[PDB]
Amino acid sequence: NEVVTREYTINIHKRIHGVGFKKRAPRALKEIRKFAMKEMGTPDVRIDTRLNKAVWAKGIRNVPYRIRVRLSRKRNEDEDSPNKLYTLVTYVPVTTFKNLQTVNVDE
Template sequence: NSSYKKGSEKKRDYSDVNEVVTRKHAINIHKGSHGVDLKKCGPWALKEIQKLAVKEMGIPDVHIDTRISKAAWAKGMRSVPYCFHVRLSRKYNEDEGSASKFCVLVTYAPVTTLKNLHSQW
């Protein structure tokens, strides 16, 4: 049947890109940090958070809060925390010279325990 498509061939529906939305995500940085140089783990973690924000929200303009940066560097450059709990907010862009109408603000959502947390939206 030609109408059937496999999971990898499906197009993602970005119809909600024109809405103001807030979503919570639990990001496991430890899974992807294998093979990364120890001296590059801190910067790599922040780049991965930014990539996730672009992928999930569909907007390339991402602003990362300083509290995420402080949390990533809290244990030093080499030992990044295993998990981050972040809030992705799609907001109207306040920069007048920007090309896109929206931007994504990534803020840190501290939690007492990271057990049984799932992404919510």
């Protein structure tokens, strides 16, 4: 109920339409963090390295239109952080993008 993980797809073109060429990719990582705090209630969001590679795989200017991403709220069992829960966000390689919904996967 609190350590649940599930699939999501994020349309970048919705969240970057308007910004300049040199700030498209940095804004996208900020929008993934903003998107992760809405569904998952944890304000602390960690973006895994392969997801950062996937957004930057086509340059800072030509950010990919659609991306399929996995959000996983975790336990935070080691750090005595003021936040008891965090979300680990990782990238899922997907070939075809049409007709995929936010399915709830089982860990």
